Protein: Lysozyme
Organism: Enterobacteria phage lambda
Amino acid sequence: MVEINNQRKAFLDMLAWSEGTDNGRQKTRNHGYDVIVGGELFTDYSDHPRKLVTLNPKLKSTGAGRYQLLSRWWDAYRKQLGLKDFSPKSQDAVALQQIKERGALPMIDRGDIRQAIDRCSNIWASLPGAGYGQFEHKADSLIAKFKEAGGTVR
Ligand SMILES: CC(=O)N[C@@H]1[C@@H](O)[C@H](O[C@@H]2O[C@H](CO)[C@@H](O[C@@H]3O[C@H](CO)[C@@H](O[C@@H]4O[C@H](CO)[C@@H](O[C@@H]5O[C@H](CO)[C@@H](O[C@@H]6O[C@H](CO)[C@@H](O)[C@H](O)[C@H]6NC(C)=O)[C@H](O)[C@H]5NC(C)=O)[C@H](O)[C@H]4NC(C)=O)[C@H](O)[C@H]3NC(C)=O)[C@H](O)[C@H]2NC(C)=O)[C@@H](CO)O[C@H]1O
């Protein structure tokens, strides 16, 4: 289980917004922690909502929780990290493990957020360079939200 410092807490929020779960527009009972992709919400946190949301006629997603974690990885990480519930706690746990895996923790820790975002581009589609054909936020606007999550850059 990864230690949460503020750079990481911010990379998370930045992701929550990039991902649009904690972006102010999206309705939510917690902070995107109950947000399912597509916008609907879940109220039971003992586990991932595992709700397959049909976004458009040609595309679907399991992405849920703050960092729009595909359930695939949720299972991977909750088992890897012995996460009991899908509490926001467990949701962060995962986000950070992936982040750590992208070897972007030293980057997040040290503010090389473009480098982290680009390093984490394969983790979240809303990030630039991700290449998931999803709406990719300009790197500049992610850095921006990140900064407003409390994160520090450069
Ligand atoms: C349809 C559609 O459009 N869907 C989109 C959806 O896909 C998007 O969601 C994102 O998807 C991508 C792609 O599926 C996901 O990306 C994957 O993310 C996982 C992270 O959870 C990655 O898995 C990890 O990969 C790393 C490799 O970089 C693994 O780490 C390595 O583990 C090995 C152990 O096996 C370590 O090796 C050992 O190392 C030691 C020293 O440490 C050495 O001494 C030993 O000898 C050595 N042992 C061996 C056997 O070699 C190694 O150190 C370590 N490396 C690092 C840096 O950690 C890690 O184990 C993997 N964990 C799991 C779990 O598999 C996966 O690689 C990555 N794939 C790609 C292609 O990037 C992404 O997670 C997902 N995000 C979300 C939120 O779900 C979304 C995004 O918005 O859009 C949809 O549209």
